[PDB]
Amino acid sequence: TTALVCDNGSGLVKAGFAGDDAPRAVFPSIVGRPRHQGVMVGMGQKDSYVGDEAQSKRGILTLKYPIEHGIITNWDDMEKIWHHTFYNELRVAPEEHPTLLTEAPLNPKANREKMTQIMFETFNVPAMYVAIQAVLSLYASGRTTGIVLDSGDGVTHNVPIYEGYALPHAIMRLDLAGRDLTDYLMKILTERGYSFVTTAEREIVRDIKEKLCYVALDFENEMATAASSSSLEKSYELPDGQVITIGNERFRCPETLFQPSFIGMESAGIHETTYNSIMKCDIDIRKDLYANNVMSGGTTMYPGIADRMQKEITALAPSTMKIKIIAPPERKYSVWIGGSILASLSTFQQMWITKQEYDEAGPSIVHRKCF
Amino acid sequence: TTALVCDNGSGLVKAGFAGDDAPRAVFPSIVGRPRHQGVMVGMGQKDSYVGDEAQSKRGILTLKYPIEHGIITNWDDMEKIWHHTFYNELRVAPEEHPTLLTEAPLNPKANREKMTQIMFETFNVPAMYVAIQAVLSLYASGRTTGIVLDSGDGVTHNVPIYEGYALPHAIMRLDLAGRDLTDYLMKILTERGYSFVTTAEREIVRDIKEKLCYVALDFENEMATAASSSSLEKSYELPDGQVITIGNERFRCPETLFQPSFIGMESAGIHETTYNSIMKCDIDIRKDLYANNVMSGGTTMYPGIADRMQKEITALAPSTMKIKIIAPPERKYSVWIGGSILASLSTFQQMWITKQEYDEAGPSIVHRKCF
Amino acid sequence: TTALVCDNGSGLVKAGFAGDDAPRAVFPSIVGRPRHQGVMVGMGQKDSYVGDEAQSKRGILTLKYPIEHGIITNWDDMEKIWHHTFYNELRVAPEEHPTLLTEAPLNPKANREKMTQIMFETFNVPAMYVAIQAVLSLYASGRTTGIVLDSGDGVTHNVPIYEGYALPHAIMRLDLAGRDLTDYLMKILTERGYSFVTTAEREIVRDIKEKLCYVALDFENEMATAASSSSLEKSYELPDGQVITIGNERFRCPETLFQPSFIGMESAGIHETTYNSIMKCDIDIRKDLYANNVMSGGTTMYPGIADRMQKEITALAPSTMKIKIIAPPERKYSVWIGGSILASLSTFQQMWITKQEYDEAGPSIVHRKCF
Amino acid sequence: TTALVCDNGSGLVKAGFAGDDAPRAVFPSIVGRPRHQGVMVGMGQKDSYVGDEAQSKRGILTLKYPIEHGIITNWDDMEKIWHHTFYNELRVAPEEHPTLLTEAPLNPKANREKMTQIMFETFNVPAMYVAIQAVLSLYASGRTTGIVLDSGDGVTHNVPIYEGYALPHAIMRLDLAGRDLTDYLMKILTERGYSFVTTAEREIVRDIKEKLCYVALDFENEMATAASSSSLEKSYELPDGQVITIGNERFRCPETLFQPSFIGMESAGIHETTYNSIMKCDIDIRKDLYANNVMSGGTTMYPGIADRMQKEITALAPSTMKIKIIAPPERKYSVWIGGSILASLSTFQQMWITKQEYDEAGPSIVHRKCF
Amino acid sequence: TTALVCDNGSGLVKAGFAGDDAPRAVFPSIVGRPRHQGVMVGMGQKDSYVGDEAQSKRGILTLKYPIEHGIITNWDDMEKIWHHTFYNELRVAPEEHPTLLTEAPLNPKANREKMTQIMFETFNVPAMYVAIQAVLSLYASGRTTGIVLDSGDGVTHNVPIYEGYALPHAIMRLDLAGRDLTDYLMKILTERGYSFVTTAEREIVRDIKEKLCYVALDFENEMATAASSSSLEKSYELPDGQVITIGNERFRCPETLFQPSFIGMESAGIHETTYNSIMKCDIDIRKDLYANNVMSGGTTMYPGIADRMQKEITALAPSTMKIKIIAPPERKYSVWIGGSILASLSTFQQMWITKQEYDEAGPSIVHRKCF
Numbered sequence A, B, C, D, E: 001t002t003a004l005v006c007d008n009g010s011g012l013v014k015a016g017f018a019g020d021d022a023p024r025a026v027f028p029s030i031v032g033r034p035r036h037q038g039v040m041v042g043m044g045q046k047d048s049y050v051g052d053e054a055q056s057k058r059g060i061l062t063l064k065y066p067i068e069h070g071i072i073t074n075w076d077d078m079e080k081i082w083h084h085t086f087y088n089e090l091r092v093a094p095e096e097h098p099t100l101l102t103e104a105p106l107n108p109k110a111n112r113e114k115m116t117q118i119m120f121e122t123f124n125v126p127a128m129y130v131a132i133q134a135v136l137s138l139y140a141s142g143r144t145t146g147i148v149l150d151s152g153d154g155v156t157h158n159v160p161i162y163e164g165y166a167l168p169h170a171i172m173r174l175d176l177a178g179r180d181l182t183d184y185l186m187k188i189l190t191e192r193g194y195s196f197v198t199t200a201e202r203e204i205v206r207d208i209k210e211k212l213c214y215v216a217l218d219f220e221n222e223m224a225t226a227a228s229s230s231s232l233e234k235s236y237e238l239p240d241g242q243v244i245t246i247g248n249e250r251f252r253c254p255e256t257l258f259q260p261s262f263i264g265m266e267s268a269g270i271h272e273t274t275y276n277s278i279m280k281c282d283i284d285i286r287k288d289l290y291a292n293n294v295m296s297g298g299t300t301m302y303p304g305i306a307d308r309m310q311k312e313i314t315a316l317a318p319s320t321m322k323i324k325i326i327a328p329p330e331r332k333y334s335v336w337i338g339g340s341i342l343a344s345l346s347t348f349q350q351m352w353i354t355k356q357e358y359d360e361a362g363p364s365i366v367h368r369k370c371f
């Protein structure tokens, strides 16, 4: 009846109904399991916990993320998350509504085929569609032209679109993502003696990162400043009441997005990737993409990231070029919002893969681009 | 009611109404189509763009010119251009006005027959006439005697007229035209490392040529000068803000009109062709044609071309002969203007091919020269 | 009222009024027609040009002479010339004045009968008379005795008159005339590589002949001189500014009047014809004719022709005989002048053929010699 | 020892030995030069090619004909052709044999004088003679009376001979020749869209003309037929395997010999020129020339030309006159054959210009007509 | 003493001595540098590795190619490669032997001038010459006529030569080359989940391409076959012992040479470019070029490419034309071999730029084409 929109990406699950201005179900893509003993199954015990349950009880659980780098690697756990979203968080049977799913570009074909098969079997979704997240992000901004940098937990990617036409030959993807920045911060923090090694401890570091990290406009000057000034230090109170101090780790962590070499990658920084996607585009496109760089995804939420990219692109770009970065307060939910918009359009109504079409065509139908 | 005048030649379309001192609809003879993907037809997308639309959106389009060397080669695209001129640019139904068309001399008979059939079927023009462009150019100058050198995008041609009588046995045509000079410049520029290989890039080179090229009065001295002096270099800013420098390419390009051998042709230069057309004319005609060389067409707009031909013809001509070149600021539109003049004459009123005459006589009527 | 006098002979038309000391209308007997295309009659075009118009526009016209060897061969064109003389050059209606016409002797009777009928029908001349050109030439000289050699464009002829009495049994006519000398020069000039083959080119050769040719007093010595000396060469500038050099062709052309064998004729030279006309005359006449050789007509204008004949006749004549050649600066117009004189005489007033006499007698009246 | 006979005329060179029934060396009068680049002279490259070499390699060469309208215009290239004939094709040193050359009538005197000087200097021919081509053509036919129409590549000419006596006052020459018919066909063919503009392309058109063109007996009926019937169309396969269709161009091309006005000439057609040469001849000659019209030269090879002239002359001629055209299968070589015959005669032995006579008399000896 | 021949093109360096039947030094044009840390310079560590060293140690190195699209972009690294070739691989001082270098056509003039300056300064080569690679490739085949398609790592180009004469106006160049096919395969392979993103991983993909890819004769049928048959799949073992399966990626990669649109280019496929170069050549050249299509360069080594072009050209060509493709087992080394042949010729001995000529003339001497 009303399409469900479900941006079930790496790290965080975001779902709600088409026409909503926000997801209704927002929770971690985590399936947790008891760590210290077996499960006393003759008692009212559980074998696994999902999302918020997994976080509240994390002190006794091993926590796994079924999606790594945008790819579902653990299908049994992924079914548990989808089940939880439909029955515990949104509380809507899948048989009642068509579902719009999202995916990062350049993923294995099998990822879509298996995801489609599940939505058409364990759940029985009347019809479905898998959209590219960057495309949806541009719909959310309202622009028809620009280069969407969708930077999430598992994948960072760039998809240029010109006046509504996709430019598929200039799509770029990096593995560097929020998950790595978090892993890097766990490493950086050992320098001050704070050792976070368990999975629950990883979640604490994720929370530290979200509250304290920022992008330095000038990395070297910020380092020099941190070296002598206590003004860049902030405290954080841990779940058990202990207090720790975070100093230059606050900007050394997100700096890796500009300098991937900090964690051993050959990858270009996010401003170089954006620039290169622009340079692979036709010369008569480039000026419009320079003026329309659209950021979305959770890692774009670091304070100052939009200004740091404005500076870095301007440095690489011609001096007479207009450089503009669009970075709304809604970025974290931009892909979901774009999904809500797309699902409600009258043209998107005719491009749903229906159950009947799926049964006759088989899994390859998921790669249909008839639009 | 009022004849339409439409010089729809190679490269650029020029149309307006008889009695106007200028075309109202001036746009490229280009039909563009999306290059990087198919067309998402369930969305508000287009399959093709025409003229100005094709130029504004050229960064994602393959651009084709339906007319090559004065010959329509792509009739489906030609119908789209004519449609665009009548309905989008002039916004006048063809059923309301007779139409004057133009053509280069020595074209295949089929070109006129097909063009006539379309004007009498897809559009339903009450009456029409196809004029030779060089003849119209002479009408625009106001002279009754002279040798019109009409040099456009696809054809360069010479048509001598003496005191109102055509001299059809001395008509000359070259394939060398503005399109080749542009193609040559794309090649010349690789010497400085600027590689223009796509169709949109061809349009950039065309713009470079129009703004920076000129005819050297003395080619060899201009080359020697360019070799040591920066004074002949000019910059050009590209659509993406990058800047390039053009040096002796500024005069090596148009020099090909005087030296066709630069692109491999056996053709005589434009001053030799003009001279030879004069020499094939009766000895008692020659002195009047020498004194009345009329230039028209877009490639005659290169700065200094009139002076270079004045020098070259004078060198070939008898020393006691008056050599004079007429080259108005309106040359680019001379053929169109001549069409406006002809269409408004009371004698040209009786020589229109009407729909009824066409239906009874068939396509061969287009070759009628009853005047 | 005042008789018109019209020596409309081969090549050149000369007309004016009786009592005038010169023609007022002097123009070529040429009717020209467009050569390269048909006539665009819906435009302000002409089908034919006459006299001076034909010469000014000759580069695009085929030029015909209606009179060949003194005989009108093209009557339609002849009417156009007469029309032009009366209405465009003299601008006098034929109905207002009687007309004196001239004719070469020994012409077909039909030539006079048709000429008379036209003057009495297309034009309505009140009265007319056809005179022999040689007789008029003698009137112009003022002599009553002598042998008039009238040498024009189409006919060369000799008419002896003794003390006012004609001697009709000694009249001689040659076809060799200025037209042949001109045709011969066109042939001679191919030796230096100057090929004149079109009708307009014939007119150029005629002009070359008129300006450069002369009669050698001693042909063989002049040839021997030309063989080693550049002093006999003269340049001529052509209508298109090209320059050519004429050498011994300057005297080889007019020599044909003394040696007709140069063009294949059996005819005697002009000095032999003059001599023979004298020898056919009575022995008591001969001495007076020898002393009164009167030259007239355009070909007598070659410099030195009077001296060459003085020498040639003296060589054929008895050594005790007085040989005298009369050759006025007015020779070109002598026949016309004689016509002016005759038309003004009181005795010539009573010998006009009137319209009434013509209508009653018919065309044979033109042969009336009642004097 | 044995005279060489060399009809080195416009277009095609024909040479062999006196007494032969055919030339041994037959090749185009063409000197070709590389077109697209300079010559890499340090490599085994050539600067120019002659005759067959020029044709085989024509795709990269500019091809020039040293003889235009029967006149040698390029003496350096003419020496190369003569050299090639003597040393590469016949392989006979000029010092060993006297040489008989031919020439069109009414050529510049300088043409013979320069040709003679070369044969007496660059080559050292023991003795030579220059014959008129039409005279030789009559010898080849075996007749002593008739009017030889020699129609080649550069000159069309008529030379009447009566019972062995030449009639030099009735010799006519036209510029219209095979070269113009070929140039006209290149123009006609643009009507079907086949544009031949390079020199090698001219050679293709020449080949098309030779294989497909014919003379219509009734031009107007043949045009009417071509208008509705495919039976007059023939295909031609081009050097690159492409195929073109030639329709009424097959007879419109050679028709120009009967209607020179098709290419802008005032010239009479070939049947009118033949007729006029007859009419300039004595009335007691005319009947024998009418019965002996002899055709020779390559343009007389068009199928049906003899029948078309039979019809046209008969139409102009008196109805009781016998009209006969002689047109042997050997016409193409008739002049050469006549040269072989003349060179072998015992009387022609005493009229050779020897080297000694030349050195003492100088170049003017070439005009000797002592026979 | 013995010229060195060095085809130091994009991707792979090939060098040896003139007269050798093969290069002696064959190694990648790669300069590698440590990736994960700085260089511990107080220890026996290196800052950079070249060629084979760079490949053996690639797991810790960033690898750069100094030549992109045939253009040297990194001159410091290029000097390191040249140094390595002369001193480590061939072990011959440059001062002892003249050197023959090669270059792709239509490169920036600066590329030759800088390359020449280095060979004349950092190394001190007695004399040098820069040859076009396609020309050398034709020498290697032994043919004097044909169209050399040299398809390497950075440039694909077509150079027609006719009977030893170059045809410089029909030279075509594409950017599409082996480097792009490799980049495309890295992208295609993400579909099966194999993500290759680092530079060393690029080298693995290059190796996969070289061992498994082929050209489908019928692309569509090969795709249809791959869709149902495991017979087109091949395994590949990775450096760490893991095994991957490559399916239709085996022919989708090289297909881009026939369909450049697969990677977003407007370029014509290689069979269309070859065809168009032929069509720009003179009609009398075309048949010989069709019969002599010569392939060279590493990308021509894909199995089946010669047969695919035979089919594609035949489809575009006239049906009566002979189409022949020459594709020797030595193609990979054809340019080098041609260099060995040229360097050993006695004519090429006189066209070397010597040190003295260079010092006096300056860098512009490198553009000398005196041959």
Ligand SMILES: C/C1=C\CC[C@H](C)OC(=O)C[C@H](c2ccc(O)cc2)NC(=O)[C@@H](Cc2c[nH]c3ccccc23)N(C)C(=O)[C@H](CCCCN)NC(=O)[C@@H](C)C1
Pocket (backbone or CB within 6 Å): B069, B071, B072, B106, B107, B108, B109, B110, B111, B175, D190, D191, D192, D193, D194, D195, D196, D197, D201, D204, D238, D242, D243, D244, E283
């Ligand atoms: C036999 C021959 C050409 C025909 C090739 C093929 C078998 O037939 C066609 O395809 C016809 C087809 C056709 C097209 C449209 C139509 O309404 C009706 C007909 N013509 C074209 O495209 C013409 C177009 C053209 C260019 N300037 C012209 C000048 C006058 C007339 C035509 C042209 N074009 C490419 C050629 O002539 C080319 C190249 C000329 C430029 C060199 N500087 N010339 C040749 O190869 C030569 C050997 C001649």
Ligand SMILES: Nc1ncnc2c1ncn2[C@@H]1O[C@H](COP(=O)(O)OP(=O)(O)O)[C@@H](O)[C@H]1O
Pocket (backbone or CB within 6 Å): A008, A009, A010, A011, A012, A013, A151, A152, A153, A154, A155, A177, A178, A179, A182, A206, A209, A210, A211, A297, A298, A299, A300, A301, A302, A303, A332
């Ligand atoms: N304020 C913030 N600052 C920095 N990172 C953030 C912030 N909020 C969320 N993130 C990071 O964003 C990622 C999750 O956001 P999201 O883009 O929704 O992920 P995904 O789209 O992969 O589900 C995590 O890596 C998380 O740490």
Ligand SMILES: Nc1ncnc2c1ncn2[C@@H]1O[C@H](COP(=O)(O)OP(=O)(O)O)[C@@H](O)[C@H]1O
Pocket (backbone or CB within 6 Å): B008, B009, B010, B011, B012, B013, B151, B152, B153, B154, B155, B177, B178, B179, B182, B206, B209, B210, B211, B297, B298, B299, B300, B301, B302, B303, B332
């Ligand atoms: N200022 C200029 N200098 C040189 N070339 C010009 C200029 N303006 C236009 N042109 C050339 O003229 C051609 C188009 O002019 P136009 O004569 O109208 O073409 P067409 O008549 O074929 O439509 C193009 O080749 C264009 O580059």
Ligand SMILES: Nc1ncnc2c1ncn2[C@@H]1O[C@H](COP(=O)(O)OP(=O)(O)O)[C@@H](O)[C@H]1O
Pocket (backbone or CB within 6 Å): C008, C009, C010, C011, C012, C013, C151, C152, C153, C154, C155, C177, C178, C179, C182, C206, C209, C210, C211, C297, C298, C299, C300, C301, C302, C303, C332
């Ligand atoms: N100065 C001149 N020298 C030689 N011939 C002349 C000269 N002037 C005129 N003629 C010739 O005279 C002829 C025309 O003179 P004219 O006697 O009036 O002819 P017609 O009486 O036949 O009209 C032409 O042949 C012309 O070339």
Ligand SMILES: Nc1ncnc2c1ncn2[C@@H]1O[C@H](COP(=O)(O)OP(=O)(O)O)[C@@H](O)[C@H]1O
Pocket (backbone or CB within 6 Å): D008, D009, D010, D011, D012, D013, D151, D152, D153, D154, D155, D177, D178, D179, D182, D206, D209, D210, D211, D297, D298, D299, D300, D301, D302, D303, D332
């Ligand atoms: N079969 C033929 N049909 C028509 N023209 C021909 C034929 N054969 C040759 N020609 C033409 O004849 C001319 C060459 O023949 P030829 O008389 O020997 O020339 P020339 O005598 O000037 O050397 C060329 O114009 C050629 O096209």
Ligand SMILES: Nc1ncnc2c1ncn2[C@@H]1O[C@H](COP(=O)(O)OP(=O)(O)O)[C@@H](O)[C@H]1O
Pocket (backbone or CB within 6 Å): E008, E009, E010, E011, E012, E013, E151, E152, E153, E154, E155, E177, E178, E179, E182, E206, E209, E210, E211, E297, E298, E299, E300, E301, E302, E303, E332
């Ligand atoms: N067997 C093969 N199949 C396909 N491509 C190959 C093969 N061998 C080499 N190549 C490709 O050829 C290129 C290098 O060959 P080469 O022509 O020598 O390059 P270059 O001339 O640019 O140095 C690389 O792109 C490489 O992948």
Ligand SMILES: [Mg+2]
Pocket (backbone or CB within 6 Å): A009, A010, A133, A150, A151, A152, A153, A297, A335
């Ligand atoms: Mg996401």
Ligand SMILES: [Mg+2]
Pocket (backbone or CB within 6 Å): B009, B010, B133, B150, B151, B152, B153, B297, B335
């Ligand atoms: Mg135009």
Ligand SMILES: [Mg+2]
Pocket (backbone or CB within 6 Å): C009, C010, C133, C150, C151, C152, C153, C297, C335
């Ligand atoms: Mg007179």
Ligand SMILES: [Mg+2]
Pocket (backbone or CB within 6 Å): D009, D010, D133, D150, D151, D152, D153, D297, D335
């Ligand atoms: Mg001949």
Ligand SMILES: [Mg+2]
Pocket (backbone or CB within 6 Å): E009, E010, E133, E150, E151, E152, E153, E297, E335
């Ligand atoms: Mg190479």
